[PDB]
Design a protein around this nucleic acid. Structure first.
Ligand SMILES: [Mg+2]
Ligand SMILES: [Mg+2]
Ligand SMILES: [Mg+2]
Ligand SMILES: [Mg+2]
Ligand SMILES: [Mg+2]
Ligand SMILES: [Mg+2]
Ligand SMILES: [Mg+2]
Ligand SMILES: [Mg+2]
Ligand SMILES: [Mg+2]
Ligand SMILES: [Mg+2]
Ligand SMILES: [Mg+2]
Ligand SMILES: [Mg+2]
Ligand SMILES: [Mg+2]
Ligand SMILES: [Mg+2]
Ligand SMILES: [Mg+2]
Ligand SMILES: [Mg+2]
Ligand SMILES: [Mg+2]
Ligand SMILES: [Mg+2]
Ligand SMILES: [Mg+2]
Ligand SMILES: [Mg+2]
Ligand SMILES: [Mg+2]
Ligand SMILES: [Mg+2]
Ligand SMILES: [Mg+2]
Ligand SMILES: [Mg+2]
Ligand SMILES: [Mg+2]
Ligand SMILES: [Mg+2]
Ligand SMILES: [Mg+2]
Ligand SMILES: [Mg+2]
Ligand SMILES: [Mg+2]
Ligand SMILES: [Mg+2]
Ligand SMILES: [Mg+2]
Ligand SMILES: [Mg+2]
Ligand SMILES: [Mg+2]
Lengths: 129, 218, 88, 18
RNA sequence: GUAAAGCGCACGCAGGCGGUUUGUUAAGUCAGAUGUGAAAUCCCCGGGCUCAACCUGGGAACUGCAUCUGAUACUGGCAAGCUUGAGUCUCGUAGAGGGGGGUAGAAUUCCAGGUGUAGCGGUGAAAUGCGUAGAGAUCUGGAGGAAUACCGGUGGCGAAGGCGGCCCCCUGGACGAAGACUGACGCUCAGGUGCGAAAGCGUGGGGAGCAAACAGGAUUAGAUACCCUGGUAGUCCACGCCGUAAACGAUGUCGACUUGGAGGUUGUGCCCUUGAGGCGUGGCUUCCGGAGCUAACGCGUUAAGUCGACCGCCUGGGGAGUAC
């Protein structure tokens, strides 16, 4: 949190999912909003909304198809003190393509499939499955 | 004042955190269950029970409570189904082979009593044996009719009779239990936010389910 | 601890306006005044380790504030130090 | 020692009160 | 945490990492192109030795480096910002927090006086010891040193080690209500610096009680060993050194997220505080226990659960935390 907001939001999502919480809230930021949009686009979450202007807050609605959680696992990849960058020809694959790996390329934040299609490398934010 | 609107509730102070949304809040120092949001799920359970009774399923009743023993025995005899008036024997479902052997032994003893036990050999020893076996005959009043293998259960409590719920879950038998406000709702797949006290309320519930199952065969 | 009157005088003399207690210059002035006041007490006693720990804490805080002020504005830092006679 | 008996007595703090 | 492994604790330089908006910088990063990366060898498709080994043609590869052209979401640099992190100001609260100086009561020992007279002390039983030059007992004065019964509590404070009579002077930290202010000023820290139980050492004082060493008694054929009577350092003070503990919660520091109950201890807001009470909201702290974790024990919102930053440490037992 004080040093890794991305890891903090990922941890919040994991804890909320394990605790069977309808939704979670966290401080909002541009990178956090982009990550939330990417997750929603892939169906990992229901919806995200930002409330407030001076101190914006990001609220994410978790999804449960059945009693088990839809987000089986979420793991940070690139963290402060150890940055991970991959070329377009060696992008990581999650669960033999069944998972989603968040990649930040020069065109923004997108799934690994989009980066491979666009042939652009970048920073691996995290693995989601 | 509907059927579920008569009882006041239960779970005075200590509560199970699992069923948080099923409690309206704390009123008059005692928590109140979501009485308004109780009739849909119960109706769904009744519909499921009717579906089960469509095939004439072997749905059982648990009467471990002395106060409710007759309250559930009347419904059991009205529906001519199986019931457990006395303490639920551990392993009745999982160890059903032992129960089958016991009921077979009881049937053999009952059949042979009229011929051999009465006066063929002795009477004093036979009288003592009959007196000893009368309690066994009283036990397993309904479950001894057929081979068992129940397709559902209607236990009146969860925390008190968690053994039955655990056995059903192990055997994958759905349970239409009226979970108490302070019990564990994880075991029961058809949790009903009802009440355990107010003998009149539970009597009305068992009467209603008996009426529904009676006409559930179409 | 520093008296209320002393704190008010320090704020008035260093703060850019009323209720300017949060300015870095005011904080540095209060810390250095407290350090100067406690120097005599420590010399008199010389065995108050717990109070010496508190003195060290305030000295470290003042050094950090001075470094931040120097990084943010050289003119403000160089004027404050000569006014307070610090950084020998 | 004059201190061990005190510690032994204080050990019984958790006997049956808490 | 208990198998090897969290420095005794804290502060802090270098270093590592760092909240949120924009602006452009294109260093890291990414995309393309160019030059180079010897041949042989490895790999793919073929060919020639009757097959194979072996030889051989063309590729691929050589994961690298340098230069140029572009993208800039992310990280970094530069310039402005923002207040949530971190701090300052105002009021009040509890506290064996620390340093210095006073003073009070009980008790032990010693000195002296009165009354009184043969024992007292000790042990499992004794003896050494004290006593007729009068003990012990009791009383009445005085001297001295050390420690603070009751309160006292799984109570409180302190970073740790530790801190208990009462009062005064100096002084540190923490917490709560409501505001105002500064605007990332932050976190962690190898070396470095400081603190650090008891024992011990150097100098000079003090010395009631206790007590290593030592003496004697008893026991034994004789011993040693517990036991008894004494008793020197030590224990206390001022300064300086020592820097070691099962210095333990065998759990490094900081931040975020995650079902619940029963207390204790300090705040504070509201309802008739009528009061003790009810309704809430903070800080610290004790016990049970859910998910989760764990080899199990067990931990469990004060995690040993889910993560992030940094530091320290460990990889068989003995040798050995020993030798140099
Ligand atoms: Mg104070
Ligand atoms: Mg060990
Ligand atoms: Mg430690
Ligand atoms: Mg530190
Ligand atoms: Mg540093
Ligand atoms: Mg930096
Ligand atoms: Mg940043
Ligand atoms: Mg570049
Ligand atoms: Mg390139
Ligand atoms: Mg080559
Ligand atoms: Mg930038
Ligand atoms: Mg004090
Ligand atoms: Mg104080
Ligand atoms: Mg002194
Ligand atoms: Mg005296
Ligand atoms: Mg404390
Ligand atoms: Mg401002
Ligand atoms: Mg060090
Ligand atoms: Mg000492
Ligand atoms: Mg010596
Ligand atoms: Mg000495
Ligand atoms: Mg001496
Ligand atoms: Mg001897
Ligand atoms: Mg002795
Ligand atoms: Mg002695
Ligand atoms: Mg050590
Ligand atoms: Mg200790
Ligand atoms: Mg240790
Ligand atoms: Mg053990
Ligand atoms: Mg526990
Ligand atoms: Mg462990
Ligand atoms: Mg070894
Ligand atoms: Mg050595």
């Amino acid at each position: 949190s004080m040093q890794d907001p991305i890891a903090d939001m990922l941890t919040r999502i994991r804890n909320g999912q394990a605790a069977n919480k309808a939704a979670v809230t966290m401080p909002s930021s541009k990178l956090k909003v982009a990550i939330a949009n990417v997750l929603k686009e892939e169906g990992f979450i229901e919806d995200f909304k930002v409330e407030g202007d001076t101190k914006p807050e990001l609220e994410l609605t978790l999804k449960y198809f059945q009693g088990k959680a839809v987000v089986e696992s979420i793991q940070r990849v690139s963290r402060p003190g150890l940055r991970i960058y991959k070329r377009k020809d060696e992008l990581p694959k999650v669960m033999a393509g069944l998972g989603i790996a968040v990649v930040s390329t020069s065109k923004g934040v997108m799934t690994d499939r989009a980066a491979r299609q666009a042939g652009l490398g970048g920073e691996i934010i995290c693995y989601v499955a | 004042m509907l059927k579920a609107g008569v009882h006041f509730g239960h779970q005075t102070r200590y509560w199970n955190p699992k069923m948080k949304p099923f409690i309206f809040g704390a009123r008059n120092k005692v928590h109140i269950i979501n009485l308004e949001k109780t009739v849909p799920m119960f109706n769904e359970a009744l519909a499921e029970l009717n579906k089960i009774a469509s095939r004439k399923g072997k749905i059982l009743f648990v009467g471990t409570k002395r106060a409710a023993s007759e309250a559930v025995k009347d419904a059991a005899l009205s529906c001519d189904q199986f019931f457990v008036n006395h303490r639920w024997l551990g392993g009745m479902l999982t160890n059903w082979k032992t129960v089958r052997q016991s009921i077979k032994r009881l049937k053999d003893l009952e059949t042979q009593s009229q011929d051999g036990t009465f006066d063929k050999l002795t009477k004093k020893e036979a009288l003592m044996r009959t007196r000893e076996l009368e309690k066994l005959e009283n036990s397993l009043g309904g479950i001894k009719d057929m081979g068992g293998l129940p397709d559902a259960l209607f236990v009146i409590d969860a925390d008190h009779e968690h053994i039955a719920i655990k056995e059903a879950n192990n055997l994958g038998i759905p349970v239409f239990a009226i979970v108490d406000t302070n019990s564990d709702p994880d075991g029961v797949d058809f949790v009903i936010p009802g009440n355990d006290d107010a003998i009149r309320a539970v009597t009305l519930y068992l009467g209603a389910v008996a009426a529904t199952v009676r006409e559930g065969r179409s | 601890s520093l008296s209320t009157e002393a704190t008010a005088k320090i704020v008035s003399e260093f703060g850019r306006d009323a209720n300017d207690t949060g300015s870095t210059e005011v904080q540095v002035a209060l810390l250095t005044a407290q350090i100067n006041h406690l120097q005599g007490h420590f010399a008199e006693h010389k065995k108050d380790h717990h109070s010496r720990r508190g003195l060290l804490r305030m000295v470290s805080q003042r050094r950090k504030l001075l470094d931040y002020l120097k990084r943010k504005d050289v003119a403000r830092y160089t004027q404050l130090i000569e006014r307070l006679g610090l950084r020998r | 020692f004059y201190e061990k008996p005190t510690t032994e007595r204080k050990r019984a703090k958790a006997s049956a009160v808490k």
